[PDB]
Amino acid sequence: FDTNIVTLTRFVMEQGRKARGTGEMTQLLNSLCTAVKAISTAVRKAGIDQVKKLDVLSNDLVINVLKSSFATCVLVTEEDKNAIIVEPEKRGKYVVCFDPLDGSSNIDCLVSIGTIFGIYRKNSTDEPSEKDALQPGRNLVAAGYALYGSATMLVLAMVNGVNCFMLDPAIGEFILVDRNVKIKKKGSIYSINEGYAKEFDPAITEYIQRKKFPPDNSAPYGARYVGSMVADVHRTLVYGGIFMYPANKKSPKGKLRLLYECNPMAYVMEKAGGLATTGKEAVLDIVPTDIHQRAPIILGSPEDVTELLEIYQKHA
Amino acid sequence: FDTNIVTLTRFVMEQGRKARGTGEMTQLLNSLCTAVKAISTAVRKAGIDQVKKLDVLSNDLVINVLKSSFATCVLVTEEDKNAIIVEPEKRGKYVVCFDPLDGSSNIDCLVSIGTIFGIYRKNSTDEPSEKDALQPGRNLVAAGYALYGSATMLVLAMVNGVNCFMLDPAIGEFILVDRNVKIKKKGSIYSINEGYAKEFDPAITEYIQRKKFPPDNSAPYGARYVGSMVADVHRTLVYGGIFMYPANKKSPKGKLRLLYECNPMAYVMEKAGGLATTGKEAVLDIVPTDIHQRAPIILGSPEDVTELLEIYQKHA
Amino acid sequence: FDTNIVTLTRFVMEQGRKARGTGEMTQLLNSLCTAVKAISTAVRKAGIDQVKKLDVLSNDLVINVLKSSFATCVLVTEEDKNAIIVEPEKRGKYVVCFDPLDGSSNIDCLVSIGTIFGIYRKNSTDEPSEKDALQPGRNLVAAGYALYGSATMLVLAMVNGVNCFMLDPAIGEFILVDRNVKIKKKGSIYSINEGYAKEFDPAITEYIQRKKFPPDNSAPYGARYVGSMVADVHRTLVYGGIFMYPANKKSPKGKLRLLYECNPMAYVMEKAGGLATTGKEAVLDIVPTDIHQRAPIILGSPEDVTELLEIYQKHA
Amino acid sequence: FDTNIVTLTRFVMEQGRKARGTGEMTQLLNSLCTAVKAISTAVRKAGIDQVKKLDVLSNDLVINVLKSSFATCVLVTEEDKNAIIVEPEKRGKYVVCFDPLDGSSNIDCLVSIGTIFGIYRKNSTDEPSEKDALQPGRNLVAAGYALYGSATMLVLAMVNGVNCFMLDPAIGEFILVDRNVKIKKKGSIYSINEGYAKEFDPAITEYIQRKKFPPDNSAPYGARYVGSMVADVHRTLVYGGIFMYPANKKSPKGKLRLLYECNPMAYVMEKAGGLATTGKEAVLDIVPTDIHQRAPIILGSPEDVTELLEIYQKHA
Numbered sequence A, B, C, D: 001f002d003t004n005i006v007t008l009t010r011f012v013m014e015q016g017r018k019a020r021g022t023g024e025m026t027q028l029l030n031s032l033c034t035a036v037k038a039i040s041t042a043v044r045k046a047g048i049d050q051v052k053k054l055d056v057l058s059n060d061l062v063i064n065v066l067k068s069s070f071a072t073c074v075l076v077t078e079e080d081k082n083a084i085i086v087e088p089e090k091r092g093k094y095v096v097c098f099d100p101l102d103g104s105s106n107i108d109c110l111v112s113i114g115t116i117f118g119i120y121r122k123n124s125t126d127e128p129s130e131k132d133a134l135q136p137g138r139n140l141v142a143a144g145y146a147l148y149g150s151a152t153m154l155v156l157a158m159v160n161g162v163n164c165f166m167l168d169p170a171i172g173e174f175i176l177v178d179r180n181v182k183i184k185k186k187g188s189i190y191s192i193n194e195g196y197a198k199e200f201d202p203a204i205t206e207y208i209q210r211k212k213f214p215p216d217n218s219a220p221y222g223a224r225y226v227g228s229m230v231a232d233v234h235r236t237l238v239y240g241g242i243f244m245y246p247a248n249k250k251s252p253k254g255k256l257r258l259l260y261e262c263n264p265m266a267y268v269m270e271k272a273g274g275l276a277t278t279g280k281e282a283v284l285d286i287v288p289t290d291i292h293q294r295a296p297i298i299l300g301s302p303e304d305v306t307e308l309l310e311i312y313q314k315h316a
């Protein structure tokens, strides 16, 4: 008769103790947890406009609560044109890259939406600026996401693993429900917006055909595409398979953004033992040039991402 | 200011007053609302097994709260083999066909799931049995669904229209947010599990390729397929387009069941002003033989459903 | 299993059905329930000024949700100088006298506060005015209160009895927990603000000393006085004893007001089977002259109220 | 658009950093916060028996969640006859003395009830036992209480002050609403169960008379006595005055218990700058002999406790 032993607050504080931290990253991670519970509650009474305004309130809660951690120096949002450089009084050493509410366009239809964040330690000697945001994702300290779906889950990936925490909204505590999550090696679902079929490169084309009409005449792959990144990525982690948003007429730049959509999700993928590629390079090694830079991303189970990379290599 | 101006309790009772009834259907409709609020509650914590534990809880909540309205004589659940005949002391004159929790499968992946219902009046003077449930959905008195997605919505369709109500979980009250919902004439999203492409009839095949490669220089349609009927159908109703679960050889009579999944959603679509076909006949005119009868279903905006029906007819 | 077996929505509508009414009082009684759930919500956060901000919010919620029932023609609030006459487009036939939030004072000290109401039918064919509210509480159609204490309870008394309903805030539903509540004949707790002992008439003085020093070797009565009428009266109803707010020179007509505090609680007490006197006449038989008229009140178990009334009569 | 800057988690972690703690007392204080939110939620749906069973669940949540902190070695509850000595694997260095749910007898009447806790650092070299609980309250590290009233508040008193945190139940976060709370020097309310008037010593008797018929002929003191300790003590802290539960026929032992009712509350009182006396000695200096030992307590504003101590001294 308990609150199932490992709550998020407890877990973060123990992992901060084991790593002999200053308590600055714990304060930061405690602040993202308060922010996500305030966004989950606002998402759930979705109006008692509400896309533009709920995305605005979400932006405002993540920025104000993160400044209050006294742990950040630069903040990058999908919503703000330029980076937020924190006030010298509130400055800590972390750079945080976030999407306060992914899939806002889907709010009206009531589709699962989510918050995506990546945390970097500030590296330079220089007075904080946009430049400190621009590290490859290989340099991420912690990264993860909250999914506001049928229930709200937080997936936190750090250096040592991926852990899933389910909000108990009755007490406002995230409980550890799944630990050291590893993705399947080969799954059975492919996920892409097939309305772009005529824009696709010939490797993506060949692959999709291979999943629908398997040459070895095994069972085809199911298709699922919620059209909300956190939800398609999350389903992939749990059930297995591949998620694709390649280059097509959105240039070989693609739609999703590197710093706050692709990199957090790629870090979660490599940590649960899967892959994240642009088709050419690993997403985590790309050196950013802009904070709102976009990148192709293909991620998911290992044996499904390698099979497509083989087709990519066959078209060279 | 207020809680809302029109609640599902104010609305339901106002309509029973305008309609001049003994208050029995009102009781049934208020019992449905208590049941939805309770399942929403259980769905939003989920785990503080998931799948075949929550849908068992949901079966239980609905059966129990409906017998207590003293308004039902026959209940048909997805979960139960046979039609439940209510004890005479609790019998009323209605037959309710329901899906306790659609897409329960998806609890682990946290995808939008929902509750589906249709209410038929008993009209057959004889001791109530399965018999009374085997009516064409053209005979529905009321139908609708509750969607547990990023927020909870109850959509209810009756004689006079389709109305959408958002749950405010802070006060446990459904508030009318959308009045006399009517679907767009032509949409721009098609929704089908393309992984069955190996098995699709040619009318479905010409349609999808015309959606991906328009003969003229149209923008192709976007594709979305959550894999949960209430979420896909709700997006359709709200934003336009078409949802198809055609006949294919793995489940050659379609997958979805007529009484509790197909008919409520066909009725909601027809009152919103869109179409719902088998491909050969309309879903609402089919007469059941079995309470668990499956049926094919193509539904959505009138112009796009028509455009596929012509292709069905083009194959003769 | 269920949400509950009998909800305040099931009960209210079942009674309107048994009673054979146009469903107008039902609408009013369902509007009261929405209003109580919303104030409970605001009372339980309190501060995320308190006092004259929350009671202003509560005044607002009640007036607004009652006009919207289209069931009220005159409203009397503690908060407003004059009786509010409802616009003809929203007028119905009832007069509601209410205290939006009793004991608002105590929000800072976090003591149990409550909402008090009495409903009178208009019976006076003339354009509605204050006039219609100035009826003896013997004329009440329904009365009761909501108590925001450790849990929320709504107690409603009508013709046929007093029933207690507990709010389940998880589903926003009031569940019948106590049916046909009847008060104990003799209690063992007296409740008065003894700091006015300098000003009390001698009948009150002989009573209290007989409670503290029984002439025989009885156990003396315990004393409790929360200082919030709904909490003191609720304890009385539920556990027995007497609550006294006698006449004294600072407020010589008593403090508590007849229409919205005294009469509802006198009516609840009389249907629970206890007594409610001024000391000289019963509170329910007094005819108002002013909507904000004050009145003395002694109420509780029949044997203890009697025992003080004899001492009043012993002084002649 | 925030979660009003200083949440309890943030405050505790900063104060743990400033004191260069190991993070063991932060883990303990984070665990009492989870426990209090799980008890507040259970208290608020008070049954959807429930006195004996809710006090039992409360006991079980505080013990299981405190063991899980890995910060305690001995636990003393009102509910357990003997002290709980923790398992060597879960052992930390703190002794915690608590009342999991004060005022449970009042649950049926819906009176404010609360949780009271005192934390001691274990002092001996010896294998932990009842003996480590038995320190004077002068040796308390931290002490405080949660009040489940109109809203839920946590009052935390530590070496440097008293801070009041209001639960925002919407997000499950305690927000700092009042800091470095100091009690008034003289208030205007006295609080005692006057049903014991004939059991009272002559100093308590003289005092009460002095408050009701003030010799200097100033204004009498109001009386308030909820009969729930956390609620009478809390009202005293905020509004001022005195709270008394002296010796009478419950011997010069009194009813309230030293380790978990009186000492936490006395520590809060001295820290907000008031007094807590048995009439003879300060409650914080008493050397306990038993864990379930009782003690007289008189606490509140300074100028009111000294005035009574003068009367105590006059009766010698």
Ligand SMILES: Nc1ncnc2c1ncn2[C@@H]1O[C@H](COP(=O)(O)O)[C@@H](O)[C@H]1O
Binding pocket: A012, A013, A015, A016, A017, A019, A020, A021, A022, A023, A024, A025, A026, A029, A141, A158
């Ligand atoms: N939960 C955590 N809290 C704080 N630091 C952590 C955590 N997990 C890992 N770390 C390591 O802790 C150092 C950060 O310390 P500081 O920024 O003073 O809190 C880094 O070496 C991160 O790798």
Ligand SMILES: Nc1ncnc2c1ncn2[C@@H]1O[C@H](COP(=O)(O)O)[C@@H](O)[C@H]1O
Binding pocket: B011, B012, B013, B014, B015, B016, B017, B019, B020, B021, B022, B023, B024, B025, B026, B029, B141, B158, B159
């Ligand atoms: N909100 C409603 N309440 C009750 N009956 C309704 C409602 N809306 C439509 N009806 C019509 O009311 C009749 C049901 O009355 P009864 O079964 O006595 O409650 C039917 O003719 C339904 O078409």
Ligand SMILES: Nc1ncnc2c1ncn2[C@@H]1O[C@H](COP(=O)(O)O)[C@@H](O)[C@H]1O
Binding pocket: C011, C012, C013, C014, C015, C016, C017, C019, C020, C021, C022, C023, C024, C025, C026, C029, C141, C158, C159
């Ligand atoms: N639950 C209830 N709903 C409606 N009216 C009720 C209820 N309980 C008692 N009544 C009686 O119903 C009549 C009110 O009918 P009407 O004003 O058309 O709604 C009155 O005679 C009240 O005494």
Ligand SMILES: Nc1ncnc2c1ncn2[C@@H]1O[C@H](COP(=O)(O)O)[C@@H](O)[C@H]1O
Binding pocket: D012, D013, D015, D016, D017, D019, D020, D021, D022, D023, D024, D025, D026, D029, D141, D158
């Ligand atoms: N919030 C707090 N967290 C931990 N220790 C605290 C706190 N506030 C004061 N202390 C001091 O911290 C020491 C406890 O350290 P430790 O038990 O390793 O956590 C003691 O000297 C307490 O006085």
Ligand SMILES: O=P(O)(O)OC[C@H]1O[C@](O)(CO)[C@@H](O)[C@@H]1O
Binding pocket: A102, A103, A105, A193, A227, A228, A229, A230, A232, A245, A255, A256, B222
């Ligand atoms: O380009 P489309 O088909 O409109 O899909 C966009 C959606 O897909 C994603 O890129 C990935 O789910 C979302 O971030 C976005 O809302």
Ligand SMILES: O=P(O)(O)OC[C@H]1O[C@](O)(CO)[C@@H](O)[C@@H]1O
Binding pocket: A222, B102, B103, B105, B193, B227, B228, B229, B230, B245, B256
């Ligand atoms: O995953 P599949 O085989 O495409 O089936 C999807 C269908 O099955 C369900 O998940 C359950 O019937 C529906 O919600 C959905 O339309």
Ligand SMILES: O=P(O)(O)OC[C@H]1O[C@](O)(CO)[C@@H](O)[C@@H]1O
Binding pocket: C102, C103, C105, C193, C227, C228, C229, C230, C245, C256, D222
């Ligand atoms: O504090 P006093 O003067 O005894 O007055 C108490 C009375 O006033 C109120 O707090 C407000 O009318 C009542 O709830 C209560 O019965």
Ligand SMILES: O=P(O)(O)OC[C@H]1O[C@](O)(CO)[C@@H](O)[C@@H]1O
Binding pocket: C222, D102, D103, D105, D193, D227, D228, D229, D230, D232, D245, D255, D256
């Ligand atoms: O002795 P009495 O009058 O029953 O009062 C007991 C109540 O008073 C207190 O001792 C102090 O409020 C409570 O702990 C307890 O429930």
Ligand SMILES: [Mg+2]
Binding pocket: A078, A099, A101, A102, A103, A261
């Ligand atoms: Mg995005």
Ligand SMILES: [Mg+2]
Binding pocket: B078, B099, B101, B102, B103, B261
């Ligand atoms: Mg189904």
Ligand SMILES: [Mg+2]
Binding pocket: C078, C099, C101, C102, C103, C261
């Ligand atoms: Mg009042």
Ligand SMILES: [Mg+2]
Binding pocket: D078, D099, D101, D102, D103, D261
């Ligand atoms: Mg106690």
